[PDB]
Design a protein around this ligand. Structure first.
Ligand SMILES: Nc1nc2c(ncn2[C@@H]2O[C@@H]3COP(=O)(O)O[C@H]4[C@@H](O)[C@H](n5cnc6c(=O)[nH]c(N)nc65)O[C@@H]4COP(=O)(O)O[C@H]3[C@H]2O)c(=O)[nH]1
Lengths: 182, 187
């Protein structure tokens, strides 16, 4: 079995998803702000933030396990449906940020492959595939400049949940980086 | 520009879709029948039928592809929290297959979506990915996925892969007939 999947994962994720949703994301965020203007407040950061745990451990629990990352509200679409997610970030127990946030789902493909009990695909093979996946997507996004102005990758080595690594602080650092550039 | 994507497409389609959708499919079909069999009619075949056109872009819609394929009804949706998305929707449709202007078959039917990904890749103006490349990647995608399913017996028993060529001078191939032949063999 050939386990060189990273190129397929990167082009699939770009062609089948990021290429399709990134052009209209800003307008959907702006619409949401306007719909909820006097009530729910405004999301100022208009980029999709894509979490990329190199260990490929991607949770499906909407981060309820991490009390400093909380699901706020769906970002509605615009019968296969493409919606996104607004999350609140907390710091020292207090609200600290709000952004459109999600995980790179194809990392879960890499995880299952290393966890499925087949022979030639270890945790070590997985990490090299995750890195190649990451690098290929970045190279792709680096030639689709309308997409990379709408999208930021948050790449990190630690477990997304558990231990002393704070994913919330990591995201917040990226939000402040982006705030600086605009 | 490295466009060897087929192996990744197959693993992605298996883990990210087939492994997730097939275990609950029979229960959704049973719910469909419980709600509709006494009026609209029920479905006897409980398997997902997945179409793999090797040498033509996946049509935008199955009735456009063949006038003898008619949309019947959607199954109850499958909703799930997925990688930060609340209630991501996975949906499947039942179609009627017509023969001599009469429904002759009914089943849960869809195209293999990675073949749409390959088609899109071939139409984006990028150099080094011709229709020839697309066709080779489509066959390798199909082969690898069947390779994977051969070690996944429950998944193999819950879906049927309908793999076919299509003539590009046309007229000598009916897609409904091709699906009907498979349905009649399953029984
Ligand atoms: N929030 C959100 N993200 C999305 C949606 N669709 C695609 N993506 C993202 O883009 C990746 C690639 O999509 P793909 O090219 O269609 O490639 C997909 C596709 O070929 C198949 N697949 C996934 N979902 C569906 C589905 O609802 N229906 C069908 N027929 N196939 C699906 O499995 C492949 C891998 O799926 P994933 O592992 O999930 O990985 C997906 C996922 O990360 C969506 O509707 N909502």
């Amino acid at each position: 079995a050939n386990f060189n999947v990273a190129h397929g994962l990167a082009w699939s994720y770009y062609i089948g998803y990021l290429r399709l949703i990134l052009p209209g994301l800003r307008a959907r965020i702006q619409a949401y702000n306007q719909r909820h203007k006097n009530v729910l407040g405004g999301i100022g950061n208009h980029r999709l933030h894509i979490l990329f745990p190199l260990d490929c451990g991607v949770p499906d629990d909407l981060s309820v396990a991490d009390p400093n990352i909380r699901f706020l509200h769906e970002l509605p679409q615009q019968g296969r449906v493409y919606t996104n997610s607004i999350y609140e970030l907390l710091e020292n127990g207090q609200p600290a940020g709000v952004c459109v946030l999600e995980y790179a789902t194809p990392l879960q493909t890499l995880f299952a492959m290393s966890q499925d009990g087949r022979a030639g695909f270890s945790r070590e093979d997985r990490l090299e595939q995750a890195k190649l996946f990451c690098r290929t997507l970045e190279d792709i996004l680096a030639d689709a400049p309308e997409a990379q102005n709408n999208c930021r990758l948050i790449v990190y080595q630690e477990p997304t949940e558990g231990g002393s690594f704070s994913l919330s602080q990591e995201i917040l650092r990226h939000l402040r980086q982006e705030e600086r550039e605009v």
